[model samples]
Target: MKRILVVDDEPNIRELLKEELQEEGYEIDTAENGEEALKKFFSGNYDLVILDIEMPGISGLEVAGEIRKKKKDAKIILLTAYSHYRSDLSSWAADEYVVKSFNFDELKEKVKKLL
Candidate 1:
């Protein structure tokens, strides 16, 4: 089973992704903020990271850059509600970006492609 870390300040988003990915048989771990997410990220073995861009501390872009420093091949997906941010994700080292209002199927498709 592949392991994935999900970082989002929103509890609803975290819980929803966790449940959705769990149902798909992926080992899911979640963090409420970028700080917690970075801590968990360095301490574990994760195949992918599903991160939120606008976070309380550290920010998803910073976290992704740090993760990139540690793991060059890390697969990261940035999730944001803002459509404008999508174009900037490539520079942040995110393999993909998913708009929040999109269906889970879009997320699933990206996950599949990345994996």
Candidate 2:
């Protein structure tokens, strides 16, 4: 099974994603913010990371850059509700980007395809 680490500050969003992805058979782990996410990034052999752009501590963009430096081959998908922030992703080297508040099926399909 693929291992995925989800990083988001909102407790509800984190739990919802963890529960939904777990049901899909992914080994899902979640962190409340980028700082905590970094700990998991260094400690585990995760195949993918799903990131929320706005969060307390280091923010998803910084975490993504750090993760890219540490694991070049690992896939990253940035998720956010801000459409204007797409420009911010241009230099991040992420594998994919998905807008939040979209259909759950679309996000799930993206995750399946990436994994």
Candidate 3:
């Protein structure tokens, strides 16, 4: 099974992804913040990371850059509610960008393609 780390500040979103992704046959791990996500990133071997853009301390853009710096081939999908951030050059580091939505079909399809 492919391993995935889902990073988001919201507990509900994290849990929802965890359960749904697991159902889709991916091994799911979650982190509630950038700090915890980074720790998990270095310690774990994950095939993909679904990262939220806005967090309290370290932003997802920064985290994505750091992850790329550490592992050039790392696969990242930036998850955010703001579509405007797509214009931000920093977000280019991510392999994919997904806007938050009630339905995760597009996100799931992207995950399938990437993995």
The 10-residue segment with the lowest total lDDT in model 2: 84-93
Q: lDDT of each prediction vs. the true structure?
A: 0.85, 0.85, 0.93
The CA lDDT at 40 in model 2 is: 89
lDDT of 3 by residue, 87-112 (tens): 89999899999998879889899999
Order of quality (lDDT): 3, 1, 2
What value of lDDT does candidate 3 attain over all alpha carbons? 0.93
Model 2 per-residue lDDT tens digits across residues 38-113: 8988899888999998997787888888888888797999887777667785436678888886357877889999
Query: What's the CA error at residue 79 for candidate 2, in Å?
Result: 1.1
Model 1 lDDT, residue 29, Cα: 90
Clashes by residue pair, model 2: none
lDDT of 1 by residue, 1-115 (tens): 9999989998988899999889888999999888898899989999999989888877787888888888899999988777777666444688887888637888888988888
